[PDB]
Design a protein around this motif. Structure first.
Motif, mmCIF file in Angstrom:
data_model
loop_
_atom_site.group_PDB
_atom_site.id
_atom_site.type_symbol
_atom_site.label_atom_id
_atom_site.label_comp_id
_atom_site.label_asym_id
_atom_site.label_seq_id
_atom_site.Cartn_x
_atom_site.Cartn_y
_atom_site.Cartn_z
ATOM 1 N N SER A 88 -51.678 4.271 8.716
ATOM 2 C CA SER A 88 -50.995 3.768 7.496
ATOM 3 C C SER A 88 -52.073 3.439 6.421
ATOM 4 C CB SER A 88 -50.195 2.517 7.830
ATOM 5 O OG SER A 88 -50.381 1.540 6.832
ATOM 6 N N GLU A 89 -51.742 3.556 5.137
ATOM 7 C CA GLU A 89 -52.765 3.349 4.099
ATOM 8 C C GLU A 89 -53.561 2.026 4.087
ATOM 9 O OE1 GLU A 89 -51.314 3.919 0.002
ATOM 10 O OE2 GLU A 89 -53.225 4.790 -0.519
ATOM 11 N N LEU A 90 -52.965 0.969 4.601
ATOM 12 C CA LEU A 90 -53.607 -0.321 4.618
ATOM 13 C C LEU A 90 -54.339 -0.563 5.907
ATOM 14 C CD1 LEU A 90 -50.760 -2.477 3.114
ATOM 15 C CD2 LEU A 90 -52.724 -1.480 1.937
ATOM 16 N N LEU A 91 -54.241 0.384 6.829
ATOM 17 C CA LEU A 91 -54.906 0.206 8.096
ATOM 18 C C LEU A 91 -56.133 1.108 8.121
ATOM 19 C CD1 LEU A 91 -55.380 1.096 11.269
ATOM 20 C CD2 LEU A 91 -54.816 -1.287 10.774
ATOM 21 N N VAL A 92 -57.300 0.488 8.298
ATOM 22 C CA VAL A 92 -58.551 1.228 8.344
ATOM 23 C C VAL A 92 -59.335 0.837 9.578
ATOM 24 C CG1 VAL A 92 -60.755 1.616 7.199
ATOM 25 C CG2 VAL A 92 -58.706 1.654 5.888
ATOM 26 N N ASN A 93 -59.856 1.839 10.268
ATOM 27 C CA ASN A 93 -60.630 1.565 11.458
ATOM 28 C C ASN A 93 -62.124 1.724 11.113
ATOM 29 O OD1 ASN A 93 -60.837 0.844 14.203
ATOM 30 N ND2 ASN A 93 -61.340 2.975 14.681
ATOM 31 N N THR A 94 -62.906 0.694 11.391
ATOM 32 C CA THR A 94 -64.306 0.696 11.051
ATOM 33 C C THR A 94 -65.071 0.539 12.330
ATOM 34 O OG1 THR A 94 -64.813 -1.686 11.008
ATOM 35 C CG2 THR A 94 -63.498 -0.778 9.195
ATOM 36 N N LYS A 95 -66.370 0.800 12.249
ATOM 37 C CA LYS A 95 -67.233 0.660 13.413
ATOM 38 C C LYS A 95 -67.193 -0.739 13.965
ATOM 39 C CE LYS A 95 -70.174 4.325 11.811
ATOM 40 N NZ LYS A 95 -71.152 4.710 10.755
ATOM 41 N N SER A 96 -66.578 -1.694 13.260
ATOM 42 C CA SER A 96 -66.556 -3.079 13.759
ATOM 43 C C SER A 96 -65.211 -3.500 14.253
ATOM 44 C CB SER A 96 -66.995 -4.072 12.672
ATOM 45 O OG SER A 96 -68.410 -4.268 12.670
ATOM 46 N N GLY A 97 -64.260 -2.590 14.087
ATOM 47 C CA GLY A 97 -62.900 -2.877 14.484
ATOM 48 C C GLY A 97 -61.954 -2.474 13.376
ATOM 49 N N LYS A 98 -60.659 -2.622 13.638
ATOM 50 C CA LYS A 98 -59.619 -2.259 12.693
ATOM 51 C C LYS A 98 -59.333 -3.425 11.758
ATOM 52 C CE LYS A 98 -57.338 0.787 16.145
ATOM 53 N NZ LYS A 98 -56.020 1.309 16.716
ATOM 54 N N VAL A 99 -59.012 -3.096 10.506
ATOM 55 C CA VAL A 99 -58.663 -4.102 9.509
ATOM 56 C C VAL A 99 -57.395 -3.661 8.823
ATOM 57 C CG1 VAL A 99 -61.075 -4.690 9.012
ATOM 58 C CG2 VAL A 99 -59.879 -3.004 7.545
ATOM 59 N N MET A 100 -56.611 -4.659 8.414
ATOM 60 C CA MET A 100 -55.330 -4.455 7.741
ATOM 61 C C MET A 100 -55.386 -5.021 6.325
ATOM 62 S SD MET A 100 -52.332 -3.349 7.863
ATOM 63 C CE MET A 100 -51.810 -3.028 9.665
ATOM 64 N N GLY A 101 -55.247 -4.112 5.359
ATOM 65 C CA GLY A 101 -55.299 -4.471 3.949
ATOM 66 C C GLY A 101 -53.987 -5.026 3.442
ATOM 67 N N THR A 102 -53.785 -5.007 2.128
ATOM 68 C CA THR A 102 -52.580 -5.518 1.502
ATOM 69 C C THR A 102 -52.409 -4.749 0.198
ATOM 70 O OG1 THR A 102 -51.455 -7.608 1.139
ATOM 71 C CG2 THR A 102 -53.453 -7.238 -0.128
ATOM 72 N N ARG A 103 -51.170 -4.449 -0.189
ATOM 73 C CA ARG A 103 -50.937 -3.698 -1.423
ATOM 74 C C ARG A 103 -50.946 -4.677 -2.586
ATOM 75 N NH1 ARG A 103 -50.032 1.712 -2.958
ATOM 76 N NH2 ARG A 103 -48.481 2.112 -4.610
ATOM 77 N N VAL A 104 -51.656 -4.320 -3.657
ATOM 78 C CA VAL A 104 -51.704 -5.199 -4.802
ATOM 79 C C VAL A 104 -51.348 -4.499 -6.079
ATOM 80 C CG1 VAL A 104 -53.556 -6.527 -3.630
ATOM 81 C CG2 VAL A 104 -54.131 -4.957 -5.536
ATOM 82 N N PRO A 105 -50.594 -5.197 -6.924
ATOM 83 C CA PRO A 105 -50.170 -4.656 -8.212
ATOM 84 C C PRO A 105 -51.358 -4.672 -9.199
ATOM 85 C CG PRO A 105 -49.429 -6.886 -8.023
ATOM 86 C CD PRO A 105 -49.962 -6.504 -6.654
#
Ligand SMILES: *[C@@H]1O[C@H](CO)[C@@H](O[C@@H]2O[C@H](CO)[C@@H](O)[C@H](O)[C@H]2NC(C)=O)[C@H](O)[C@H]1NC(C)=O
Ligand SMILES: *[C@@H]1O[C@H](CO)[C@@H](O[C@@H]2O[C@H](CO)[C@@H](O)[C@H](O)[C@H]2NC(C)=O)[C@H](O)[C@H]1NC(C)=O
Ligand SMILES: *[C@@H]1O[C@H](CO)[C@@H](O[C@@H]2O[C@H](CO)[C@@H](O)[C@H](O)[C@H]2NC(C)=O)[C@H](O)[C@H]1NC(C)=O
Ligand SMILES: *[C@@H]1O[C@H](CO)[C@@H](O[C@@H]2O[C@H](CO)[C@@H](O)[C@H](O)[C@H]2NC(C)=O)[C@H](O)[C@H]1NC(C)=O
Ligand code: NAG
Ligand code: NAG
Lengths: 534, 534
Positions: free
Chosen positions: A3-20
């Motif tokens: 999903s666009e707000l979900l990114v997997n990095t070498k340190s683990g997965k992170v969940m973003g947030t949509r902003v206007p």
């Protein structure tokens, strides 16, 4: 997973947030940790890489701000408070924030903002630093890092592994290391990273340009109203050590060994250190902070000046500049006779104590030399001329001339220099008129706040801000702020011989040469020779 | 006995000659002796009063000029030759000249001209000094004195009664004593005597204002482009003595005692001394003359500066001023890269050696300080700017700033000061354009040459000259250059607080304040402190 707000990095997965943003939306990943919390026995220590986590790291809200002195000179005044911490303060503050265009880019230009704040304050979460207008408008992945300030980030007992000095610069470096290693998963190009910062942040950028251990982590740089050689930006190891013990002396510390001193300081609650930190500087001056980078022989191999002379630094392109009235803020806060609500006409007496305050390391002769250089002898008792003369003295000595020195030295070995002089006063400025085009006030235009109508900027100010944002972004992406084949006026390269720069305001661009040469030859050549001789 | 050209004085009878002037006629008594011939064993000695003579002294032709170096840089060029001796030179040269209105006045204003010439040259008989236009036009008795210059008038072996120093100043004094005692028989008022002179003559005037032994001989003074404190106008007794022996060293003199040295020097023919006199100055400079007044403890009780500070001087009214381009002549004659027929654009290199030449007693730091003060850093390689900058440096340092210092000190205790800045370039000047309003070129207007049509001056120049001649004459007569109830523009008094002066040219008068303060604060306050400290 996916999903666009979900990114997997070498340190683990992170969940973003949509902003206007200006009627559209983008992704934001806020508060991603890049280091272990520098708490407990870690206080004053070099940072450690953040240990990878399992699960999804919630990156939807701003992190805490690092422990710092909070400005309370004007309770409620937006002009001073827009710079204060807007999140809870905590020693656990090593996080970065990323604004990413939607849909997620594949491999685009990356800009990493380093905040200023005199090495004793600053936050990445300030509204003026909100990265969304720039990411959205210029299609750049925008990063905001953070780092320890004050004693937390700069207490220096050289020789000790517990409080070596420069940890806040190491914090920045670690964040740059993290962007280098992971920005690709957010769609950013790790080969095209530009670090930019203002004031201490601009100085930091230059220190990373100098430091061998940092040069490889980025491609190019932008420095705003700050240089690594600024007189307030660094001290010797001997001096750092003296200040560190004086700090212990204010907290009733056992001072028999570094271990003893350090142990005591790690015991104090954060606010205990902040409460006494302004008591350590050994001389009276415009600037009263004591904890800054140290010329240590590691982060900086040798004196900043010898490094500059010999070309010991990253050769690349740089874009940098100053604001017209760099000195007004410092005067307001640290010189007698200056007030927020008066015109601050300066008595010829308050003028003399002002120069002493401004050039604290000068002897009498040097004090006279400065005075003569800035006095209109035909009208020496004019209160406005004394006020503006002092504004120039402080701005020239602490920001502009150190930067012109840096730029002239750099250009000799660099691969492209672009210089600007920002002199547009914002129509909505809440600070008094006497302050002019204030130190720090070009940031709002670099970050595109004038595009938000509710902020009450004028139409031409929105235009200036788009021109600026585009110059910063085009330069970050290509190493030239100009559009290849555009038909807009051209910002020329600053060269050793011609030394061209442009004004940055609402009127048609204008090219000039030798930015404040008369004054800077005095501060960079004459005054020093005078003080070494006498 | 009894006729307009026959005057009986306390020293004997003298016979004048009728002279034509602007279509009228006046009387002239030329070559009246006021001292014994300073020849033989009298060389270097104080003058002696002229012994009275019986019979009638023939005062119809100009006397001899004193032995001096003759300028031959431009054989045939009128611009330099109008300053050379126009009579035979002789050690027997102590005479004065008087121009008297016809019919003979009963008790009118007297002006005594003291010629300049750097204390090594000068004549009272020059055509630019012809007193008739002024006597006739302003109804003043005009006196022209003379005095020994060079080694003849200033060789100084302090302690010796044979060559004490300052004899040329004593020569002047003796002439002033004679005017005091006899000007009444020529119809001049001995109570209203004004001494005026230019350059070394203006310095001389100021030295008589200082010297107790001279103050009583005159009423007021006018100083043109010269001050007693000029750096080229006086030396210490130690230095005079050193130069005197160096002079003996060039003439193969026994140097074991003053008596030995002096004996040898009195043996040499005049021209032998003149041939080697430029070899004695111990440093290289713009000015190469060695024999000038000495601060001896007699003619000058103490340092010129302490006398000025304490008010140890005649309190009266003074009228003084400078020309806009005081330095051009000195540069032409003593600095490399300056020539009469080129524009003398100055290489940045020739500029640096120029400042060294101009401030010979400065160390490196002081040399840099001067350079920075006069350099336009935006255009540091401009040959005309370097040429004019050097013109200003030399003029400011050697004439203008020493005079502003004298005037500010004097006004504190004096009884009225009037200051001018002459900046009109004569339309017929034969010297190159680059020289501007040249040192010395206001003299022709003070003496009214522009009223002689054949001299090719313009109509406005004749007007400027009448305005000037009238200011000099009205001030000499009353102590104010302005006509009581006239309706002409008013030349204000220069006061401690306002420091007003007027321009002196062909356009409507204009009042200004603080003549070259920016530069003179540097030469009178900063540079000295810098050199004392370093
Ligand atoms: C920045 O660096 C590049 C490459 O290092 C410079 O471009 C080179 O210019 C030289 C001489 O002008 C040529 O011999 C090479 O063929 C060029 N290389 C490339 C890839 O074009 C460029 O001139 C430098 N720019 C500045 C402003 O210093
Ligand atoms: C933009 O300008 C308006 C117009 O003055 C500002 O609104 C005023 O704000 C003060 C403080 O909030 C209030 O006391 C007034 O009642 C407001 N006046 C009006 C007419 O609304 C507004 O604050 C400005 N916007 C920003 C972000 O500063
Ligand atoms: C020059 O000196 C005269 C007299 O010494 C000054 O005139 C005197 O002025 C004071 C105060 O203004 C009076 O008390 C006297 O009565 C005045 N005496 C005369 C004779 O008028 C004159 O002001 C001085 N001028 C300057 C410019 O200093
Ligand atoms: C006033 O101007 C005239 C006009 O040029 C000068 O006369 C010239 O003088 C030179 C040198 O004596 C001669 O070679 C010319 O033949 C003269 N020309 C004319 C037209 O007469 C004259 O010298 C000037 N007067 C003075 C006193 O300098
Ligand atoms: C992330 O935190 C925000 C506010 O703290 C909250 O509203 C949201 O539900 C959280 N998301 C997760 C998955 O924990
Ligand atoms: C004075 O001298 C001039 C020229 O030397 C001469 O013509 C005149 O006759 C002389 N007069 C007397 C009385 O000697």
């Amino acid at each position: 997973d996916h999903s666009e707000l979900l990114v997997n990095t070498k340190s683990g997965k992170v969940m973003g947030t949509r902003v206007p943003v200006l009627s559209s939306h983008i992704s934001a990943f806020l508060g991603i940790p890049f280091a272990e919390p520098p708490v407990g026995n870690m206080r004053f220590r070099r940072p450690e890489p953040k240990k990878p986590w399992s699960g999804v790291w919630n990156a939807s809200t701003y992190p805490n701000n690092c422990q710092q002195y909070v400005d309370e000179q004007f309770p409620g005044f937006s002009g001073s408070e827009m710079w204060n911490p807007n999140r809870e303060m905590s020693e656990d503050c090593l996080y970065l924030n990323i604004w990413v265009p939607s849909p997620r880019p594949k491999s685009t230009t990356v800009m990493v903002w380093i905040y200023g704040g005199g090495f004793y304050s600053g936050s990445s979460t300030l509204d003026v630093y909100n990265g969304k207008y720039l990411a959205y408008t210029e299609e750049v992945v925008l990063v905001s890092l953070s780092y320890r300030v004050g004693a937390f980030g700069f207490l220096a007992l050289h020789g000790s592994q517990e409080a070596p000095g420069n940890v806040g610069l190491l914090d920045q470096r670690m964040a740059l290391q993290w962007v280098h290693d992971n920005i690709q998963f957010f769609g950013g190009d790790p080969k095209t990273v530009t670090i930019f910062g203002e004031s201490a942040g601009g100085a930091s950028v230059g220190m990373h340009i100098l430091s061998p251990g940092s040069r490889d982590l980025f491609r190019r740089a932008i420095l705003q109203s700050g240089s690594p050689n600024c007189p307030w930006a660094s001290v010797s190891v001997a001096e750092g050590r003296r200040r560190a013990v004086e700090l212990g002396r204010n907290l009733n510390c056992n001072l028999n060994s570094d271990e003893e001193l350090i142990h005591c300081l790690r015991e104090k609650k954060p606010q205990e250190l902040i409460d006494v930190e302004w008591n350590v500087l050994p001389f009276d001056s415009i600037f009263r902070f004591s904890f800054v980078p140290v010329i240590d022989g590691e982060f900086f191999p040798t004196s900043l000046e010898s490094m500059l002379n010999s070309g010991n630094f990253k050769k690349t392109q740089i874009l940098l500049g100053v604001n017209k009235d760099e000195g007004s803020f410092f005067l307001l806060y640290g010189a007698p006779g200056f007030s927020k609500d008066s015109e601050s006409k300066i008595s010829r007496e308050d003028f003399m104590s002002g120069v002493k305050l401004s050039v604290p390391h000068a002897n009498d002769l040097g004090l006279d030399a400065v005075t003569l250089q800035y006095t209109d002898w035909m009208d020496d008792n004019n209160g406005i001329k004394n006020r503006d003369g002092l504004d120039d003295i402080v701005g020239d000595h602490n920001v502009i001339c150190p930067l012109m020195h840096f730029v002239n030295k750099y250009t000799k070995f660099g691969n492209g220099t672009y210089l600007y002089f920002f002199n547009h006063r914002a129509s909505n400025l809440v600070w008094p008129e006497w302050m002019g085009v204030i130190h720090g006030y070009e940031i709002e235009f670099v970050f595109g706040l004038p595009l938000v109508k509710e902020l009450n900027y004028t139409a031409e100010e929105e235009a200036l801000s788009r021109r600026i944002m585009h110059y910063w972004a085009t330069f970050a992406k290509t190493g030239n702020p100009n559009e290849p084949h555009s038909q807009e006026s051209k910002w020329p390269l600053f060269t050793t011989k011609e030394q061209k720069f442009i004004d940055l305001n609402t009127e048609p661009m204008k090219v000039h040469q030798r930015l404040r040469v008369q004054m800077c030859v005095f501060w960079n050549q004459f005054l020093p020779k005078l003080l070494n001789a006498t």
